[PDB]
Short mmCIF file of C-alpha atoms in Angstrom, two decimals:
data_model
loop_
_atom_site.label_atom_id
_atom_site.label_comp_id
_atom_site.label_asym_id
_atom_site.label_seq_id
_atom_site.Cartn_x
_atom_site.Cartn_y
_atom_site.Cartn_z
CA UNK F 52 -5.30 -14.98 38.70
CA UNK F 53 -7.69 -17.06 36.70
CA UNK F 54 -11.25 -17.79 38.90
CA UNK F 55 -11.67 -20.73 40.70
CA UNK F 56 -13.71 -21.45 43.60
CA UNK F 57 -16.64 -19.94 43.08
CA UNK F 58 -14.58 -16.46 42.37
CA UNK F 59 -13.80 -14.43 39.25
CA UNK F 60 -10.93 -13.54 38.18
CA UNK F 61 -8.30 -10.80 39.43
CA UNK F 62 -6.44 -8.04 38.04
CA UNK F 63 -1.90 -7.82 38.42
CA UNK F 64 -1.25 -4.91 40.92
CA UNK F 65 1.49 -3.48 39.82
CA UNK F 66 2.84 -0.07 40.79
CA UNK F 67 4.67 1.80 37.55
CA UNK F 68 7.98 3.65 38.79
CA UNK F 69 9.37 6.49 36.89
CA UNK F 70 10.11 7.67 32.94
CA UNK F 71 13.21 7.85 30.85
CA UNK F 72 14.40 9.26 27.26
CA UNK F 73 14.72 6.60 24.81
CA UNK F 74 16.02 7.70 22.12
CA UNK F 75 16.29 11.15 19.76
CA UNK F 76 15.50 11.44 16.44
CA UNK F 77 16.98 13.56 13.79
CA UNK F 78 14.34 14.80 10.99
CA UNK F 79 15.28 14.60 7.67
CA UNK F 80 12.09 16.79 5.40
CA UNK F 81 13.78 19.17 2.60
CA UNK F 82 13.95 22.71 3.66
CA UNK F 83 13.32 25.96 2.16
CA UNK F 84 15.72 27.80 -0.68
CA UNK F 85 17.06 31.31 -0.78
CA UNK F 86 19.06 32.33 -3.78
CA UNK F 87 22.41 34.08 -3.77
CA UNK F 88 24.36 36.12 -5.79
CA UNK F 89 27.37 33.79 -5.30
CA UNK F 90 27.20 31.43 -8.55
CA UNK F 91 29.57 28.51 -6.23
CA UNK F 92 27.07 27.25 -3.61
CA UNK F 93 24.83 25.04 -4.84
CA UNK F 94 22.07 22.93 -3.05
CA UNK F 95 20.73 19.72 -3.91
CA UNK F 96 17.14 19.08 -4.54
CA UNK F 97 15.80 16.17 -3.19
CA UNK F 98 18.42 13.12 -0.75
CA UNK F 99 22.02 12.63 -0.68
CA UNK F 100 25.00 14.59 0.61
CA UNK F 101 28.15 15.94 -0.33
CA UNK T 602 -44.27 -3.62 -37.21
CA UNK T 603 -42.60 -4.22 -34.23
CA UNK T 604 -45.61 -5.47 -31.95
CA UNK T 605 -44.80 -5.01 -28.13
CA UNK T 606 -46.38 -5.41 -24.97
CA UNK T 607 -46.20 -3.35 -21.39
CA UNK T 608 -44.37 -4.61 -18.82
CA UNK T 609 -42.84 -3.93 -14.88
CA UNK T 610 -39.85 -5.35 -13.08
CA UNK T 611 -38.38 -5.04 -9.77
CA UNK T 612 -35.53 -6.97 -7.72
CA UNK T 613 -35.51 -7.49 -4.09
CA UNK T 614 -33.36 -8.78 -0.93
CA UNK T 615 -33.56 -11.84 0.76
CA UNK T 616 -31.22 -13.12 4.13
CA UNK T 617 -30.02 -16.63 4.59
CA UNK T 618 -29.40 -18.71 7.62
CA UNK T 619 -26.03 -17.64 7.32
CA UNK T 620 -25.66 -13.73 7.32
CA UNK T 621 -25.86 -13.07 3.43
CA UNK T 622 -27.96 -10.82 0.96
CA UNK T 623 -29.40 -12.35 -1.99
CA UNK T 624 -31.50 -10.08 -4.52
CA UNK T 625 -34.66 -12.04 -6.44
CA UNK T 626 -35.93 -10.40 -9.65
CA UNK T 627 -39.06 -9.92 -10.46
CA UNK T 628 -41.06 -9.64 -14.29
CA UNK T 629 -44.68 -8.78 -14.61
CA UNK T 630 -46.14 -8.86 -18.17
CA UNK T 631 -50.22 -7.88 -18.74
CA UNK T 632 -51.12 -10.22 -21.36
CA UNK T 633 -54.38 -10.29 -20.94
CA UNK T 634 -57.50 -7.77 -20.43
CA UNK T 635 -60.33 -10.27 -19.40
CA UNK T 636 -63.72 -9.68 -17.86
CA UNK T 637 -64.27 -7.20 -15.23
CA UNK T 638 -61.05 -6.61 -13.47
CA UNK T 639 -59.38 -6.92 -17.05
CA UNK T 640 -55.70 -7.21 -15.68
CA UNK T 641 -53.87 -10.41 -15.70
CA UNK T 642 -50.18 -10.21 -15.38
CA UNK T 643 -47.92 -13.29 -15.24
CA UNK T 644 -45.16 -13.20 -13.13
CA UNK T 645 -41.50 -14.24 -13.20
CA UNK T 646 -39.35 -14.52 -10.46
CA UNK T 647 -35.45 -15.10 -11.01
CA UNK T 648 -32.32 -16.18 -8.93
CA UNK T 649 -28.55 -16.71 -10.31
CA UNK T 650 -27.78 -19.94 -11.25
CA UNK T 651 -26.24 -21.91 -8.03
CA UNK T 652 -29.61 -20.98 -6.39
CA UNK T 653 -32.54 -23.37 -6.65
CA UNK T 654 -36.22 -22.05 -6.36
CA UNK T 655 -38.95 -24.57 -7.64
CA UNK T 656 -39.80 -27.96 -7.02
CA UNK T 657 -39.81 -29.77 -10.14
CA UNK T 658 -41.71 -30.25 -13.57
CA UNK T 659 -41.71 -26.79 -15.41
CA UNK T 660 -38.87 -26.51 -14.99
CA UNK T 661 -35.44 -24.75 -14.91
CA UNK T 662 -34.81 -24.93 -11.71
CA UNK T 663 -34.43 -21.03 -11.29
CA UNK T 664 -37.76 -19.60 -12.47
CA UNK T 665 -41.10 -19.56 -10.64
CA UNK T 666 -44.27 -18.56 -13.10
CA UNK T 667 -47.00 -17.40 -11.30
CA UNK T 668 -49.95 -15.22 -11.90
CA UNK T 669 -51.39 -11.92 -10.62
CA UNK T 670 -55.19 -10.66 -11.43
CA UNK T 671 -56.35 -6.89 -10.38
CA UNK T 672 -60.16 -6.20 -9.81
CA UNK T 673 -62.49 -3.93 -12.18
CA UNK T 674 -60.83 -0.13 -9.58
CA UNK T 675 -57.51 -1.52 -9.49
CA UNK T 676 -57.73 -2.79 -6.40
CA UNK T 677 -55.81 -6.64 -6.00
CA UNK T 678 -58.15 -9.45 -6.62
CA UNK T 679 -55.31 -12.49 -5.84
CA UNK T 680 -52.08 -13.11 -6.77
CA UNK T 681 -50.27 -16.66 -6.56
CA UNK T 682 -47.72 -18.89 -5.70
CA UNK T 683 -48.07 -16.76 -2.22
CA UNK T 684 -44.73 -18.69 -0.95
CA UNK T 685 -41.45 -19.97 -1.96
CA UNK T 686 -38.82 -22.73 -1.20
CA UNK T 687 -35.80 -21.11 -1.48
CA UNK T 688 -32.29 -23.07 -1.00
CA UNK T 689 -28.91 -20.94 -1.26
CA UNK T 690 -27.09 -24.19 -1.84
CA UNK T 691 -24.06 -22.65 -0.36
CA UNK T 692 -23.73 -24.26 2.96
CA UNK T 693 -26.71 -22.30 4.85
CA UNK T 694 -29.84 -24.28 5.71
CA UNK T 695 -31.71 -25.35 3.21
CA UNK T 696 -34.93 -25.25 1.93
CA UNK T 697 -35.53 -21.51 3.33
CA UNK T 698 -39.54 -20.88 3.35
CA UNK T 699 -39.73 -17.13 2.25
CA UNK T 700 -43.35 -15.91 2.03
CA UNK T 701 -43.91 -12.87 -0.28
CA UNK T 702 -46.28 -10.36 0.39
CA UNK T 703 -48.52 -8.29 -2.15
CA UNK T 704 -51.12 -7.09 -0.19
CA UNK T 705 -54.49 -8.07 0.86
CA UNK T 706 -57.34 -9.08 -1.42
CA UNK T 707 -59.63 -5.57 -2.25
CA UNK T 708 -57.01 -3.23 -1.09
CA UNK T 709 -54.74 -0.37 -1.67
CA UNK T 710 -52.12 -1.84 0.26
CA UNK T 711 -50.40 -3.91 -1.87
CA UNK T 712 -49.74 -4.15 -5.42
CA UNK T 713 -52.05 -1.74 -7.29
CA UNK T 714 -53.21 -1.35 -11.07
CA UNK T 715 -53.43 2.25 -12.22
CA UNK T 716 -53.54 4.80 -15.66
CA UNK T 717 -50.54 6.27 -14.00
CA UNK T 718 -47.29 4.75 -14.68
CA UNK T 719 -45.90 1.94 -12.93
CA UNK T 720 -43.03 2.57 -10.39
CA UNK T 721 -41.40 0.42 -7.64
CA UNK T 722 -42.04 1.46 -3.80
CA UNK T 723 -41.60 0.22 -0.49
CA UNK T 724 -39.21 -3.26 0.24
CA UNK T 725 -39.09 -4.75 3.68
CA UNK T 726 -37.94 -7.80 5.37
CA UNK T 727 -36.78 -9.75 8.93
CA UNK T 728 -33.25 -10.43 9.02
CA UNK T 729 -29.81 -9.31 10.47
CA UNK T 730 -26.25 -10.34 10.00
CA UNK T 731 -24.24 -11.66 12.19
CA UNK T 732 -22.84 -10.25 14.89
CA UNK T 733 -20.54 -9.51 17.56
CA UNK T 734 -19.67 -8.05 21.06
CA UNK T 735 -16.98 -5.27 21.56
CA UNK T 736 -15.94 -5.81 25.36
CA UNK T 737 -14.13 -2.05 25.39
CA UNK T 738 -17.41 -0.46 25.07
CA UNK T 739 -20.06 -0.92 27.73
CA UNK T 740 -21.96 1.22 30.02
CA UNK T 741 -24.37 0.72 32.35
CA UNK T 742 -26.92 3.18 32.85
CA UNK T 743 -30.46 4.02 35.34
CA UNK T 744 -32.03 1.29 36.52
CA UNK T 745 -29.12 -0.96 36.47
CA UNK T 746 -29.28 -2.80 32.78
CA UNK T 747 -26.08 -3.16 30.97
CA UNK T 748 -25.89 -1.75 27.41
CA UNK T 749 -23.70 -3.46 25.09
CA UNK T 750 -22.58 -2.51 21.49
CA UNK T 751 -21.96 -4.90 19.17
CA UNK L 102 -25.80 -8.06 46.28
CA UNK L 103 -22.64 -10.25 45.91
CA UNK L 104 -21.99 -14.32 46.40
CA UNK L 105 -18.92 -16.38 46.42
CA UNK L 106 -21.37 -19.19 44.81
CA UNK L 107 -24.35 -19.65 43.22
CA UNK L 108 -25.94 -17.08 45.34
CA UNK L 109 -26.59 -19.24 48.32
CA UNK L 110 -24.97 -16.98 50.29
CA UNK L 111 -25.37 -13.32 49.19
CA UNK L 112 -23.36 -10.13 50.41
CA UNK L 113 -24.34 -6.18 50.46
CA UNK L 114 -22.07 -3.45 49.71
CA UNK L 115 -22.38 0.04 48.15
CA UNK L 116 -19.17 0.11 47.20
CA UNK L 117 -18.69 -0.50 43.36
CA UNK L 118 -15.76 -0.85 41.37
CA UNK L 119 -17.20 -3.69 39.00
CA UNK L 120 -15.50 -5.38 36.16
CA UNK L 121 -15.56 -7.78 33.37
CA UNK L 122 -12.85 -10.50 33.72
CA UNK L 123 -11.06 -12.42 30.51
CA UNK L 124 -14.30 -14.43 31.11
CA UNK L 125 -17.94 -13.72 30.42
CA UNK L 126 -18.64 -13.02 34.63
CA UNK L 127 -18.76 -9.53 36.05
CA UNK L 128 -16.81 -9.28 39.28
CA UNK L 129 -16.09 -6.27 41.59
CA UNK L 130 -12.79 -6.21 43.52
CA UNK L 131 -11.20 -9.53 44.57
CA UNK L 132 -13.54 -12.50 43.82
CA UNK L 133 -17.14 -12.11 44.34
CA UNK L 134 -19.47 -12.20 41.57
CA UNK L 135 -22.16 -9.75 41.59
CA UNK L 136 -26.23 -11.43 41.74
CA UNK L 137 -28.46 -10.14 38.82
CA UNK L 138 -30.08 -11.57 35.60
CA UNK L 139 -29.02 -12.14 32.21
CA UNK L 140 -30.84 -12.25 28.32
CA UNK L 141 -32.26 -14.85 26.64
CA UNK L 142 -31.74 -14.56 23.25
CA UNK L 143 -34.79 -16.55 21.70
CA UNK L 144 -36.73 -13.91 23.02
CA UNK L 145 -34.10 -10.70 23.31
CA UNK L 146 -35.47 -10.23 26.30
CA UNK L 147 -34.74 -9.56 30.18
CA UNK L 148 -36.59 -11.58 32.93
CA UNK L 149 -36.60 -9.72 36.13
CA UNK L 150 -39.08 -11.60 37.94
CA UNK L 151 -37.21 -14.56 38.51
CA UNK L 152 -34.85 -15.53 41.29
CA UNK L 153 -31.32 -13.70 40.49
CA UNK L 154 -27.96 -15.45 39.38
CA UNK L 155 -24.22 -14.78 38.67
CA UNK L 156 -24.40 -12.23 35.80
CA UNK L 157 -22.38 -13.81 32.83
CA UNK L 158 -21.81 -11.68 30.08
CA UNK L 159 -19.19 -13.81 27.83
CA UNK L 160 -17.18 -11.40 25.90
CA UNK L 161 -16.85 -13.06 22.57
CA UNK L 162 -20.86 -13.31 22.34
CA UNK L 163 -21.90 -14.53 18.69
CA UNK L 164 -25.49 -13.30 17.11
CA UNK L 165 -26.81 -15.88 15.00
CA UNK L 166 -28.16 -14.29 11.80
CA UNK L 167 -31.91 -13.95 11.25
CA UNK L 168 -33.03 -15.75 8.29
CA UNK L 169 -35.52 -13.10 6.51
CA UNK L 170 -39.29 -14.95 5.84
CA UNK L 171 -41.62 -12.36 4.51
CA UNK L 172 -40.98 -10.06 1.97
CA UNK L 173 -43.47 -6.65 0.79
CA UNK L 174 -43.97 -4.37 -1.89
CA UNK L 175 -46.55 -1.50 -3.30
CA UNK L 176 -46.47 -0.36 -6.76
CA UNK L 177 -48.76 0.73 -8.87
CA UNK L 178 -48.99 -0.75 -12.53
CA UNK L 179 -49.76 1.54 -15.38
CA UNK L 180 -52.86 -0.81 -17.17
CA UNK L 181 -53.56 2.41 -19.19
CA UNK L 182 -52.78 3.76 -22.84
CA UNK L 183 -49.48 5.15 -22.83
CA UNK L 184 -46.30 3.14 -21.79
CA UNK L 185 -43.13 4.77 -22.24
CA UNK L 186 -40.30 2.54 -23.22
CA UNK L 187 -41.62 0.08 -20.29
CA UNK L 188 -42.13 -2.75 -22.56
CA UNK L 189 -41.34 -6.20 -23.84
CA UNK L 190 -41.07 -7.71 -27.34
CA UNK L 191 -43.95 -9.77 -28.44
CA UNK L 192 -43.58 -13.80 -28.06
CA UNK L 193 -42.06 -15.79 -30.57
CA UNK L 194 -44.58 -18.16 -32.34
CA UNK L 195 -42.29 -20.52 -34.45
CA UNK L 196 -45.17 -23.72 -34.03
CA UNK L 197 -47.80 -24.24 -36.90
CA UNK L 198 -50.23 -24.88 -34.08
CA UNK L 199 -49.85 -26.08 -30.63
CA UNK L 200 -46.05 -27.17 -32.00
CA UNK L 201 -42.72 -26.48 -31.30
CA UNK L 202 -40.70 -27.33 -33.94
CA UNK L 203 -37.40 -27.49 -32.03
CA UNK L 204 -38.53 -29.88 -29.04
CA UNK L 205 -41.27 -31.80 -31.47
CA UNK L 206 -43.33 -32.84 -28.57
CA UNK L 207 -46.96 -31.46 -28.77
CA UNK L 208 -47.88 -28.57 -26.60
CA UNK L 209 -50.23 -26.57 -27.54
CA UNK L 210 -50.67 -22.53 -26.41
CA UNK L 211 -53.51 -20.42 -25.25
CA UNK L 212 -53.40 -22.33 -22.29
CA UNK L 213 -52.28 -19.61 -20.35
CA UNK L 214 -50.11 -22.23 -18.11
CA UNK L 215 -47.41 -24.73 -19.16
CA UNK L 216 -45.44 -21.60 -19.87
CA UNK L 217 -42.50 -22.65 -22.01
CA UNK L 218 -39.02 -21.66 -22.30
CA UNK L 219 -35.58 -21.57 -24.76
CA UNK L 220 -32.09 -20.54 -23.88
CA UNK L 221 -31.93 -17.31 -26.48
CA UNK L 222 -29.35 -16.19 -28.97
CA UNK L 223 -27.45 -14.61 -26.27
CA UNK L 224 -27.51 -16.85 -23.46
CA UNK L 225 -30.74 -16.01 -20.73
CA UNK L 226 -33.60 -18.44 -20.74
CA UNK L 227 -36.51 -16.96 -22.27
CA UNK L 228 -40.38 -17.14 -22.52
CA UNK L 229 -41.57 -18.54 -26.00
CA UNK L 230 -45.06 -19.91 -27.97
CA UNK L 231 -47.42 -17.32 -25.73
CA UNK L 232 -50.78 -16.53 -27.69
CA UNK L 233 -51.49 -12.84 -26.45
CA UNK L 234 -55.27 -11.55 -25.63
CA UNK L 235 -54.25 -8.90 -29.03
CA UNK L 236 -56.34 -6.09 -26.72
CA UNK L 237 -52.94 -6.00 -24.90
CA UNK L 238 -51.14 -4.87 -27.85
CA UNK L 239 -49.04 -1.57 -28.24
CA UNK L 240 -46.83 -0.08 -30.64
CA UNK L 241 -43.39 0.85 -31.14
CA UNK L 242 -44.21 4.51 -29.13
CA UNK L 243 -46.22 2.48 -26.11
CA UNK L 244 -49.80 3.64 -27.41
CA UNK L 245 -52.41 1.01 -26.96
CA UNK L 246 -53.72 -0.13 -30.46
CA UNK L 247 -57.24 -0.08 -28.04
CA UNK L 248 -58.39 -2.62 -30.46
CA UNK L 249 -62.34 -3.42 -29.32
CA UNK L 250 -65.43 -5.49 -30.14
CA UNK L 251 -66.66 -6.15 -33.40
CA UNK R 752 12.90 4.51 -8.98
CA UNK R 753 11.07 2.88 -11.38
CA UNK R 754 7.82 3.90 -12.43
CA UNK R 755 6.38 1.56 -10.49
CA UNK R 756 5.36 1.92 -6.33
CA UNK R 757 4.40 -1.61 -5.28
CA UNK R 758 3.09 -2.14 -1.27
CA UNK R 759 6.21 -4.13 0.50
CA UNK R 760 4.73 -5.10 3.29
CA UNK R 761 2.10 -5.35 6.03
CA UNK R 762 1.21 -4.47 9.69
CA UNK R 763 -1.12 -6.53 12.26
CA UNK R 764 -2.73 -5.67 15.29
CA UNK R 765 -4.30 -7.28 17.36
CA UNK R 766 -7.01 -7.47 20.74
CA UNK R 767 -7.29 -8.98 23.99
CA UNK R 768 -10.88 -10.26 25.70
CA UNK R 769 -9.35 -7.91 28.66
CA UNK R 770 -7.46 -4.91 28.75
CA UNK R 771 -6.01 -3.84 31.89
CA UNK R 772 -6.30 -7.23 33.04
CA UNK R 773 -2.64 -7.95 31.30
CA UNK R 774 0.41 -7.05 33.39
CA UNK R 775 2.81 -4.05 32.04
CA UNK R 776 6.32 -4.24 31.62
CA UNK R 777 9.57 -1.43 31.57
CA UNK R 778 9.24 0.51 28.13
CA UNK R 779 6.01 1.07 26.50
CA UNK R 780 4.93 -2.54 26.65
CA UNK R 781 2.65 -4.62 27.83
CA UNK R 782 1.93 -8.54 28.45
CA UNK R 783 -0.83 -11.00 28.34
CA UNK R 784 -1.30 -12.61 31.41
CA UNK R 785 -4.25 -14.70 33.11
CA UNK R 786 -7.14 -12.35 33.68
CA UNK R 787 -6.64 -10.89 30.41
CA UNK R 788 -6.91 -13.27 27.72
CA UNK R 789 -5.46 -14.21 24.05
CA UNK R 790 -3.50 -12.51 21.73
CA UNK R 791 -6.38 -12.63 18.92
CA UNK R 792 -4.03 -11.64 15.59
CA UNK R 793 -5.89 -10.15 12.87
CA UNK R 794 -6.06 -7.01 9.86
CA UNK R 795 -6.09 -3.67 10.27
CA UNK R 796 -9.81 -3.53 10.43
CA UNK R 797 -12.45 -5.81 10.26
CA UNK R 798 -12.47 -7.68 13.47
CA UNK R 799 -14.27 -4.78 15.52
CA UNK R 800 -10.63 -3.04 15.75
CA UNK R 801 -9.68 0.39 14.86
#
């Protein structure tokens, strides 16, 4: 409330009830390379899939 | 061959009535030795060109030409104009009445003449900026008077 | 101390939970605003002694800037022998005598006032027609020619 | 993928003559409210905000 008569003003009183999971995230940072002896398995360097 | 003739400048800050620096130069030039306190050094003082300084008659509007004479020890004998009108012409107040300051007459204080060389030091002045209040940021403390930050 | 008005009818507590509002006045819980005394800003000062009133802080409070007035210096100023690159070239003398030959009107020098001045090849505004004491005079290197007497 | 790395866009912020005075709603938010005061939109940094 906004002050009036002769009174400042007043704060809401609200209570706050509870939390809840809004959403996951997947992370998408390139990862670390191990080579292979196996000359068919490549892996791409930088974004996009196969 | 190339006659020339010593020589001192300096550049100093000035507020407005709105919250703004302006830097004045400053040129002193001995030109003359005379009598007992030989020194006699005309002075120059600048400001860029939407400034105004001067009343009228000399007279680009910018430059004030004064005069400055040191007695027989080095010790300030006068110095003059001792004031300035001084109008931004930028919206803030006009006609600004700065006073300069060189020291008083027969003292060390101000402006000095010396064998040593000549070197700036020292620059002081009233004057803020505007400002304002940040309401997050409070506290009172003893004796009950409330800080504020802004 | 605590009123509902101008103070006319004050309330004691020791309770305090106090609290700025979205305007200037500094309230506890529900209402009341609590007695005390606020700045005045021509002096930046506090006045305890008088009678107290609601304590109004507004939150968007505005400093006016301070327009600087004075302005100080100290520097010494080397009147000796031996300048170091702290000069100034010599002034032009293009009159025959007490004649410029670019405005034609007669002024003549040595007056050591009327100072005159010429926008230069460049573009500053510059100093010309000065007659010089000659005891002032120093080389290319800064040594004083120490010219004397007879 | 050009060369080039232009700035696309830009974020506001902005402050309120009264926190804790606005009223809070479900989710992370929050709502001005009397008591509280204005919205007040402005850069990053300059008007006294972080």
């Amino acid at each position: 409330t906004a002050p009036t008569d002769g009174r400042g003003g007043s704060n809401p009183l609200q209570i706050g009830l509870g939390v809840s999971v809004s959403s996951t995230t997947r992370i998408h940072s390139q990862g670390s390379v191990q080579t292979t002896d196996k000359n068919t398995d490549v892996a791409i360097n930088g974004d996009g899939f196969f | 061959e190339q006659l020339k003739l010593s020589a001192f400048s300096a550049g100093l800050e000035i507020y407005d009535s709105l919250g703004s620096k302006h830097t004045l130069e400053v040129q002193f030039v001995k030109q003359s030795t005379t009598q007992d306190g030989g020194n006699e050094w005309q002075m120059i003082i600048r400001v860029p060109e939407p400034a105004e300084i001067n009343t009228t008659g000399e007279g680009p509007t910018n430059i004030i030409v004064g005069t400055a004479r040191f007695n027989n020890d080095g010790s300030l004998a006068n110095y003059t104009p001792k004031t300035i009108n001084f109008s931004p012409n930028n919206g803030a107040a006009p006609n600004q009445q700065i006073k300069l300051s060189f020291g008083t007459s027969g003292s060390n204080d101000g402006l000095v003449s010396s064998n040593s060389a000549s070197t700036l030091t020292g620059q002081a002045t009233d004057g803020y900026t505007s400002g304002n209040l940040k309401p997050d940021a409070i506290r009172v403390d003893d004796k009950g008077n409330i800080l504020g930050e802004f | 101390m605590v009123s509902d008005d101008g103070g006319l009818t004050n309330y004691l507590t020791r309770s305090g939970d106090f609290k700025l509002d979205a305007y200037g006045n500094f309230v506890n819980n529900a209402g009341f605003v609590v007695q005390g005394w606020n700045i005045n800003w021509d002096d930046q000062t506090i006045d305890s002694s008088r009678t107290p009133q609601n304590i109004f802080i507004d939150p968007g409070m505005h400093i006016p800037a301070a327009k600087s007035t004075e302005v100080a210096i100290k520097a010494n100023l080397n009147s000796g022998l031996n300048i170091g690159t702290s000069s100034r070239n010599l002034y032009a003398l293009d009159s025959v005598h007490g004649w410029n030959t670019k405005t034609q009107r007669a002024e003549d020098e040595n007056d050591t006032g009327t100072t005159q001045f010429y926008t230069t090849s460049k573009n500053s505004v510059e100093v010309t027609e000065k007659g010089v004491d000659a005891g002032a005079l120093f080389n290319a290197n800064g040594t004083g020619l120490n010219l004397r007497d007879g | 993928t050009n060369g080039k790395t232009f700035a696309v866009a830009k974020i506001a912020m902005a402050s309120v003559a009264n926190n804790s005075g606005l009223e809070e709603i479900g989710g992370n938010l929050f709502k001005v409210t009397a008591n509280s005061g204005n919205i007040v939109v402005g850069e990053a940094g300059t008007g006294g905000r972080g």
